[PDB]
Amino acid sequence: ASVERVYQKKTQLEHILLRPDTYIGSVEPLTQFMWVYDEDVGMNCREVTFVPGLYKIFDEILVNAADNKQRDKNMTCIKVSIDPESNIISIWNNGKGIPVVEHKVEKVYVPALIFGQLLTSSNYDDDEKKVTGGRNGYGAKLCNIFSTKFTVETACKEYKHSFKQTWMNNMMKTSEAKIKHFDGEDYTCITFQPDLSKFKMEKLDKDIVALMTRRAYDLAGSCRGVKVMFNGKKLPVNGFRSYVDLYVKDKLDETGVALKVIHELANERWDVCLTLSEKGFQQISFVNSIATTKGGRHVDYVVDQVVGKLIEVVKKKNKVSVKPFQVKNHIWVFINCLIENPTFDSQTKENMTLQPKSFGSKCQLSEKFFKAASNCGIVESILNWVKF
Amino acid sequence: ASVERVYQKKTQLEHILLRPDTYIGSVEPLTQFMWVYDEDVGMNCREVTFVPGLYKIFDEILVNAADNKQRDKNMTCIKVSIDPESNIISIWNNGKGIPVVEHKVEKVYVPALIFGQLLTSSNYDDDEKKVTGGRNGYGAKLCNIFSTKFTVETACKEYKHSFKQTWMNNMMKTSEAKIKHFDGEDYTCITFQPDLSKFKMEKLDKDIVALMTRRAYDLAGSCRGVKVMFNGKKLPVNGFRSYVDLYVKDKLDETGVALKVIHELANERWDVCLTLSEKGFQQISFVNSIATTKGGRHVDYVVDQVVGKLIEVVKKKNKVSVKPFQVKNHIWVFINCLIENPTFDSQTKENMTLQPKSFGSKCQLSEKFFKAASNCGIVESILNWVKF
Ligand SMILES: CCCc1cc(=O)oc2c(C(=O)N3CCCc4ccccc43)c(OCCN3CCN(C)CC3)ccc12
Ligand SMILES: CCCc1cc(=O)oc2c(C(=O)N3CCCc4ccccc43)c(OCCN3CCN(C)CC3)ccc12
Ligand SMILES: Nc1ncnc2c1ncn2[C@@H]1O[C@H](COP(=O)(O)OP(=O)(O)NP(=O)(O)O)[C@@H](O)[C@H]1O
Ligand SMILES: Nc1ncnc2c1ncn2[C@@H]1O[C@H](COP(=O)(O)OP(=O)(O)NP(=O)(O)O)[C@@H](O)[C@H]1O
Ligand SMILES: [Mg+2]
Ligand SMILES: [Mg+2]
């Protein structure tokens, strides 16, 4: 092999297709137990087989829609549509559209810049302490790159125009945008056909659809003040507590007693529910409407408080040494939080790494919450084990 | 705020400094319990305060040295030097140097291309099934960018020349390389002064030095056939079992009985040790000499086999329902493996996501290993709990 064959340079766009894993996650199938929203049983925990990268390109567009609530607090609605037969996904939101105007530095229309060029974002000035999920300037381009067709439609009354542009063939082909007079209610709609060949798939199957559907339920629970519709029907979830009920309202512990679920909205930025786990530590958490499926410092921050107080309670009845990991082993925690300028160790944002001192707010759970936590069966489970 | 202030485009080099977390991990301090190699006590588990990104720029250069064993199986030695007072770290390796010749496409010297330009690698052709840790073409440039001074010295008898070039100021300044006749034993030496201001540090303190030192011990344990020296002294670790002994040889269980440690070299590519954990599930694992500190599919692959067999053993004595997570709760596993073309969800490579069918080898543990595993106290701990 010559020097030029061994030592190679790639462009950024080449690198994304060659090394998708750090951008969107694995492009190969994964089987694991997780929660999905199925057509027959609704929310349930089962083995699911799906391609992470396909989940993530959908998630990037969904979180971008949620992020628009920060740009326009008057936004009220996100509508998600998935048609497996035609292979078309659309995510629509109201509130302010994107300025339909030429960027005076980049010399292209703003929507074309931020959907068609890498490393473009409204989230690069961190002196603005924002609680958007967007941070890196990649997500929408990654969806475009992994789509055979990707259409951006946006209408912005302030600029008196609507914009529609379509990319094809993994963001490699496009054509002139359609610009028209607009004076109505603003919106943005992203419509895409995922490139299933990139994921070794023939069709959007039941498992990936059930996962994407569950993300829409997540958003109904996590994004305050935004209603979510899925395939033309409003999701009947009106806040985080009602979302948590989808997991725990009909569940019993192993002794046949209903799970006792405790809740506190500590402040606008921290919503916490807690109950007993009999399957080891479990957390369901969102940072800025991102599902932090590997957790992070926000989970540790909440859990450590509970663990500390419950250790105190057990100690007043253990006259041996009960260890924090043993207490955490019995906790199922649900957290919805808003973090200023969060950091993550990957574009997929599964693990939120920002230290609590930088969150921009605190979650100081009340003594009433801690007393309630001491009554949800965790203390009993620890004490019963102190006999062994 | 105008359109041009809100919507911004960044260059790749700008993006790395603005968003370091997905490239090198957090640039803010972290405190956590982990294993380090201290000057007073050697290997020990304690709270450590360190900046992950600084650990990682060192790790990138260390794993690059280990990777040279794949390019030249005759390599025998890596030498690591850390001087906190002068702020100089050097990592030297023998075996083949890098070709000191002009790349005919990029029109620069090969070492200058692959240490001074982003997205450059010898690991971009995946039809070669390699067991190097390098995959993405970033690591060495990331160290350069996060260094106030970064020097590459390499000597390659085949090309009859040595090369020395220095970059300064976060890879923003350099000068003409020094090219000289060379006809001796090949080597490469990377010498850098980390930009501590990027990590809000004044000096390489005891904690970061103890972590970097431990990585050198890891390499002595993980990289077959390569001796490691640290500050001029050979590390007395001669293979993976002797490395594992640093953790477990002097440890007792809570009843005062020495931990029973079982071992199998299943084949050249899989080395496994196992013992009892009393602190919840624990794994220490390496993929291609990378410390996979969040685990991955290689850990699950090994652990699931053990868990399955131990469930069988318990069942022959539990005449209630013992769950896999309960068995895993008692496992401390150590794994050193070589995986073809591994994938990870981040440049920091903490979590290896490649599915087992793609590993290029299997680890089928023997019935003798499983019998030994049934005698290391895990089964006893599970059964004792079956009484409760
Ligand atoms: C690569 C993508 C991985 C992933 C994507 C995704 O969307 O959800 C995931 C969820 C999950 O379903 N949820 C539900 C709500 C969103 C959320 C936020 C944080 C944590 C979890 C979740 C998940 O749950 C595992 C549940 N355990 C399974 C068995 N175990 C014993 C106990 C429970 C594991 C991975 C994912
Ligand atoms: C951001 C960087 C994080 C990190 C970097 C690094 O180098 O090592 C780490 C290790 C660690 O020391 N080792 C030792 C050898 C290399 C290795 C490979 C896989 C897993 C672990 C490790 C670590 O251990 C936690 C040990 N538990 C702590 C308490 N707990 C109850 C039980 C034990 C946690 C994080 C890191
Ligand atoms: N639905 C939307 N409504 C309004 N603006 C949007 C919408 N979707 C995307 N944008 C804009 O397009 C930009 C680019 O989106 P994207 O590529 O996802 O980057 P990001 O969200 O800023 N960061 P990240 O998702 O972490 O890579 C965003 O910064 C927003 O300004
Ligand atoms: N010590 C070394 N000896 C020989 N070649 C080296 C050495 N260090 C680096 N290289 C070469 O320099 C290239 C660039 O290194 P690097 O930037 O770390 O990328 P990588 O190791 O290929 N992939 P990654 O580390 O995953 O970003 C490697 O691909 C090797 O060809
Ligand atoms: Mg985004
Ligand atoms: Mg490398």
DSSP A146-173: TEEEEEEEEEEGGGTEEEEEEEETTTTE
How far apart CA A68 and CA A123 sit, in angstroms, is: 12
Residue A91 beta carbon below 6 angstroms from any ligand 3 atom: no
Q: What is the 3-state secondary structure (H, E, C) of B142-211?
A: HHHHCEEEEEEEEEEHHHCEEEEEEEECCCCEECCCEEEECCCCCEEEEEEEECHHHHCCCCCCHHHHHH
Contacts of A197 (CB under 8 A, 6+ apart): none
Q: Are A204 and A192 in contact (CB under 8 A)?
A: no
How far apart CA B197 and CA B169 sit, in angstroms, is: 12
> Nearest Cα to A67, choosing from A300, A386, A338?
A338
Domain A261-386 bears CATH identifier 3.30.230.10: yes
How far apart CA B271 and CA B244 sit, in angstroms, is: 11
Q: For ligand 3, what atom is nearest to the CA of residue B7?
A: 31
Q: Ligand 1 center to residue B136 CA distance, Å?
A: 28
Contacts of B120 in chain A (CB under 8 A): 7-10
Structure token pair of residue B41: 């006590």
- Give the minimum alpha-carbon distance from A346 to chain B in angstroms, rounded to a whole number: 5
How far apart CA B359 and CA B355 sit, in angstroms, is: 7
Residues in chain B: 388
Q: Which of B12, B344, B387 sits opposite A21 (nearest CB)?
A: B344
How far apart CA A184 and CA A68 sit, in angstroms, is: 18
The amino acid sitting at B349 is K
How far apart CA A261 and CA A277 sit, in angstroms, is: 11
Beta strands A187-194 and A147-156: pairing type? antiparallel
Q: Ligand 6 center to residue A375 CA distance, Å?
A: 52
Torsion from C-alpha of A178, A180, A184, A187, nearest 10 degrees: 20
Distances (CA, A) of B309 to A29, A37, A45, A274, B36: 26, 34, 25, 34, 33
Tally of CB atoms within 10 A around B203: 11
Q: Say whether B77 sits in a helix, a strand or coil.
A: strand
- Give the minimum alpha-carbon distance from B103 to chain A in angstroms, rounded to a whole number: 6
Structure token pair of residue A171: 């963001």
Tell me, rounded to whole angstroms, the distance of Cα B139 from its chain centroid.
Answer: 12
Beta strands in chain B, from DSSP E residues, in sequence order: 8-9, 30-38, 42-50, 77-83, 88-94, 120-121, 147-156, 161-168, 173-174, 178-181, 187-194, 227-230, 233-234, 262-267, 270-276, 282-287, 290-291, 295-296, 331-337, 351-352
Q: Ligand 5 center to residue A136 CA distance, Å?
A: 7
How far apart CA A28 and CA A31 sit, in angstroms, is: 10
How far apart CA A194 and CA A57 sit, in angstroms, is: 8
Tally of CB atoms within 10 A around A74: 10
How far apart CA A309 and CA A325 sit, in angstroms, is: 14
- What is the dihedral sign for C-alpha A141, A142, A148, A151? negative
- What is the fold, at CATH topology level, of the domain defined by B30-239? Heat Shock Protein 90 (3.30.565)
Annotated binding residue at B348? yes
Q: Say whether B346 sits in a helix, a strand or coil.
A: coil
> Nearest Cα to A279, choosing from A319, A325, A332, A321?
A332
Architecture of the structural domain at A30-236 = 2-Layer Sandwich (3.30)
Q: Ligand 2 center to residue B323 CA distance, Å?
A: 26
> Nearest Cα to B97, choosing from B17, B31, B221, B182?
B182
Q: Which of A4, A9, A279 sits opposite B119 (nearest CB)?
A: A9
For chain A, which residues make up each domain, given as ranges? 30-236, 261-386
Q: Are B57 and B51 in contact (CB under 8 A)?
A: no
Residue B225, phi-psi category: left (phi > 0), alpha (psi -120 to 50), beta (remainder): left
How far apart CA A175 and CA B97 sit, in angstroms, is: 48
**Helices B240-248 and B206-222 sit at what angle, rounded to 10 degrees?**
140
Find the residue in A nearest to B103 (Cα). Answer: A4
Q: Are B182 and B157 in contact (CB under 8 A)?
A: yes
Structure token pair of residue A324: 């924090």
The amino acid sitting at A232 is G
- What is the dihedral sign for C-alpha A344, A345, A347, A348? negative
Q: Please list every protein residue whose CB sits less than 6 Å from any atom of ligand 1.
A: A 25, 33-35, 45, 52, 55, 218, 279, 282-285, 291-293
Phi, psi at A98, each rounded to 5°: -95, 135
> Nearest Cα to B162, choosing from B173, B151, B154?
B154
**Helices A240-248 and A206-222 sit at what angle, rounded to 10 degrees?**
140
Q: Which residue of A28, A293, A328 sits with most ligand 1 atoms within 8 Å of its CB, as the best mutation to test the pocket?
A: A293
Q: Are A246 and A217 in contact (CB under 8 A)?
A: yes
Torsion from C-alpha of A286, A287, A289, A290, nearest 10 degrees: -80
Contacts of B162 (CB under 8 A, 6+ apart): B97, B100, B153, B154, B155, B156, B179, B180, B181, B182
Structure token pair of residue A115: 């959907």
Q: Do B137 and A15 touch (CB under 8 A)?
A: yes
How far apart CA B376 and CA A97 sit, in angstroms, is: 63
How far apart CA B121 and CA B115 sit, in angstroms, is: 9
Q: How was this structure determined?
A: X-ray
Q: Are A120 and A64 in contact (CB under 8 A)?
A: no
Print burial letters for B210-230: b (CB count within 10 Å at least 16), e (below 16).
bbbbbbbbbbbbbbeebebbb
Q: Are B27 and B21 in contact (CB under 8 A)?
A: yes
Find the farthest-apart pair of alpha carbons in chain B and give their distance in angstroms, rounded: 77
Contacts of B9 in chain A (CB under 8 A): 105-106, 113, 117, 119-120, 137
Task: Check residue B238 and report its DSSP letter.
Answer: -
**Which uninterrupted H or E stretch holds A79?**
strand A77-83
Q: Are A175 and A152 in contact (CB under 8 A)?
A: no
Contacts of B176 (CB under 8 A, 6+ apart): B165
